[PDB]
């Protein structure tokens, strides 16, 4: 059983480029300190320095053994409450148990979800059940792996009703320089993502999806261009003429500067620019 993170290859390309990147002109912060002693500490969030609009999250995390125990506690300023604790089973190799807590906006009480992952040498099985008091929802995930092609489908069955609430789908193939994954988010958005590497130049990813309702094609391309070990520029544009770039610059061992800006080609000069300035601090050594 040599089972790679195939489920993770379904959205690694897509999630990064698909995200809008709507910066309100504010500051993003991230600080992560790792120790291989069960300790992981993360501080993250965004603050608008124009008056005082600070919303973020604080993560108290526990990391014991790389492929063993990971405890995640996080609380958002939005009052939402997130928990995810993962334990890898040593008897059943490829068996992953994680206990999740869903982050309640108004309730303030975290809610219990049970997340299970079984890896078979060709395909990945995942059972995730969110327990609501009036009607729990059980979502089943299956990632398929067959010579050259990688596939996935995650379905949400709502026992609160008689019905599926979310339908997620993934298909594609992996090649030396090209990775393609067709991804579906509900019946409402279905499209494909292409990951292409330009040797020693830059790396580009394409995401475009069709959204049910009208004949809309959503097209977007992102490329991360690295010239320096301490400097890498990542730019993406969406077919809505929206150009957003993020510049990652390392200022000495421990400080990452991330400049991000979405320029609405619709009329940035008179319509406004989207801005995100982010500092990422890390303690490893």
From Swiss-Prot:
<dbReference type="GO" id="GO:0097001">
    <property type="term" value="F:ceramide binding"/>
</dbReference>
<dbReference type="GO" id="GO:0006869">
    <property type="term" value="P:lipid transport"/>
</dbReference>
<feature type="modified residue" description="Phosphoserine">
    <location>
        <position position="13"/>
    </location>
</feature>
<feature type="modified residue" description="Phosphoserine">
    <location>
        <position position="240"/>
    </location>
</feature>
<dbReference type="GO" id="GO:1990542">
    <property type="term" value="P:mitochondrial transmembrane transport"/>
</dbReference>
<dbReference type="GO" id="GO:0070062">
    <property type="term" value="C:extracellular exosome"/>
</dbReference>
<feature type="transmembrane region" description="Beta stranded">
    <location>
        <begin position="80"/>
        <end position="89"/>
    </location>
</feature>
<dbReference type="GO" id="GO:0110099">
    <property type="term" value="P:negative regulation of calcium import into the mitochondrion"/>
</dbReference>
<feature type="modified residue" description="Phosphoserine; by NEK1">
    <location>
        <position position="193"/>
    </location>
</feature>
<dbReference type="GO" id="GO:0015288">
    <property type="term" value="F:porin activity"/>
</dbReference>
<dbReference type="GO" id="GO:0005741">
    <property type="term" value="C:mitochondrial outer membrane"/>
</dbReference>
<dbReference type="GO" id="GO:0006915">
    <property type="term" value="P:apoptotic process"/>
</dbReference>
<feature type="modified residue" description="N-acetylalanine">
    <location>
        <position position="2"/>
    </location>
</feature>
<feature type="cross-link" description="Glycyl lysine isopeptide (Lys-Gly) (interchain with G-Cter in ubiquitin)">
    <location>
        <position position="274"/>
    </location>
</feature>
<feature type="cross-link" description="Glycyl lysine isopeptide (Lys-Gly) (interchain with G-Cter in ubiquitin); alternate">
    <location>
        <position position="20"/>
    </location>
</feature>
<comment type="function">
    <text>Non-selective voltage-gated ion channel that mediates the transport of anions and cations through the mitochondrion outer membrane and plasma membrane. The channel at the outer mitochondrial membrane allows diffusion of small hydrophilic molecules; in the plasma membrane it is involved in cell volume regulation and apoptosis. It adopts an open conformation at low or zero membrane potential and a closed conformation at potentials above 30-40 mV. The open state has a weak anion selectivity whereas the closed state is cation-selective.</text>
</comment>
<feature type="transmembrane region" description="Beta stranded">
    <location>
        <begin position="26"/>
        <end position="35"/>
    </location>
</feature>
<feature type="binding site">
    <location>
        <position position="20"/>
    </location>
    <ligand>
        <name>ATP</name>
    </ligand>
</feature>
<feature type="modified residue" description="Phosphotyrosine">
    <location>
        <position position="67"/>
    </location>
</feature>
<feature type="transmembrane region" description="Beta stranded">
    <location>
        <begin position="178"/>
        <end position="185"/>
    </location>
</feature>
<dbReference type="GO" id="GO:0030855">
    <property type="term" value="P:epithelial cell differentiation"/>
</dbReference>
<dbReference type="GO" id="GO:0046930">
    <property type="term" value="C:pore complex"/>
</dbReference>
<keyword id="KW-1134">Transmembrane beta strand</keyword>
<feature type="transmembrane region" description="Beta stranded">
    <location>
        <begin position="254"/>
        <end position="263"/>
    </location>
</feature>
<keyword id="KW-0445">Lipid transport</keyword>
<dbReference type="GO" id="GO:1903146">
    <property type="term" value="P:regulation of autophagy of mitochondrion"/>
</dbReference>
<keyword id="KW-0406">Ion transport</keyword>
<feature type="transmembrane region" description="Beta stranded">
    <location>
        <begin position="95"/>
        <end position="104"/>
    </location>
</feature>
<dbReference type="GO" id="GO:0036444">
    <property type="term" value="P:calcium import into the mitochondrion"/>
</dbReference>
<dbReference type="InterPro" id="IPR001925">
    <property type="entry name" value="Porin_Euk"/>
</dbReference>
<dbReference type="GO" id="GO:0044325">
    <property type="term" value="F:transmembrane transporter binding"/>
</dbReference>
<dbReference type="GO" id="GO:0007612">
    <property type="term" value="P:learning"/>
</dbReference>
<keyword id="KW-0007">Acetylation</keyword>
<feature type="transmembrane region" description="Beta stranded">
    <location>
        <begin position="273"/>
        <end position="282"/>
    </location>
</feature>
<dbReference type="GO" id="GO:0016020">
    <property type="term" value="C:membrane"/>
</dbReference>
<feature type="modified residue" description="N6-acetyllysine; alternate">
    <location>
        <position position="266"/>
    </location>
</feature>
<dbReference type="GO" id="GO:0005739">
    <property type="term" value="C:mitochondrion"/>
</dbReference>
<feature type="cross-link" description="Glycyl lysine isopeptide (Lys-Gly) (interchain with G-Cter in ubiquitin); alternate">
    <location>
        <position position="266"/>
    </location>
</feature>
<dbReference type="GO" id="GO:0031966">
    <property type="term" value="C:mitochondrial membrane"/>
</dbReference>
<feature type="cross-link" description="Glycyl lysine isopeptide (Lys-Gly) (interchain with G-Cter in ubiquitin)">
    <location>
        <position position="110"/>
    </location>
</feature>
<dbReference type="GO" id="GO:0045121">
    <property type="term" value="C:membrane raft"/>
</dbReference>
<feature type="transmembrane region" description="Beta stranded">
    <location>
        <begin position="231"/>
        <end position="238"/>
    </location>
</feature>
């Amino acid at each position: 059983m040599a089972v790679p993170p195939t489920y993770a290859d379904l959205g690694k390309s897509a999630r990064d480029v698909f995200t809008k990147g709507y910066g309100f002109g504010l500051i993003k912060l991230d600080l992560k300190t790792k120790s291989e002693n069960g300790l992981e500490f993360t501080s993250s969030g965004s603050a608008n320095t124009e008056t005082t609009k600070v919303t973020g999250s604080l993560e108290t995390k526990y990391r014991w053994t790389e492929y063993g125990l990971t405890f995640t506690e996080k609380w958002n300023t939005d009052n939402t409450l997130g928990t995810e604790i993962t334990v890898e089973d040593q008897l059943a190799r490829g068996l992953k148990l994680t206990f999740d807590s869903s982050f309640s906006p108004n309730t303030g009480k975290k809610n219990a979800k049970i997340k299970t992952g079984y890896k078979r040498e060709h395909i990945n099985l995942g059972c995730d059940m969110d327990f609501d008091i009036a009607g729990p929802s059980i979502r089943g995930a299956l990632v398929l792996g067959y010579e050259g092609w990688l596939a996935g489908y995650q379905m949400n069955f709502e026992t609160a009703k008689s019905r599926v609430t979310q339908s997620n789908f993934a298909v594609g193939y992996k090649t030396d320089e090209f990775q393609l994954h067709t991804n579906v988010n509900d019946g409402t958005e279905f499209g494909g993502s292409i990951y292409q590497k330009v040797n020693k130049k830059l790396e580009t990813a394409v995401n475009l999806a069709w959204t049910a309702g009208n004949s809309n094609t959503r097209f977007g391309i992102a490329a991360k261009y690295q010239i320096d070990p301490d400097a890498c520029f990542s730019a993406k544009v969406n077919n809505s003429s929206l150009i957003g770039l993020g510049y990652t610059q390392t200022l000495k061992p421990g400080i990452k500067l991330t400049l991000s800006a979405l320029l609405d080609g619709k009329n940035v000069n008179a319509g406004g620019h989207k801005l995100g300035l982010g500092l990422e601090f890390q303690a490893l050594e």
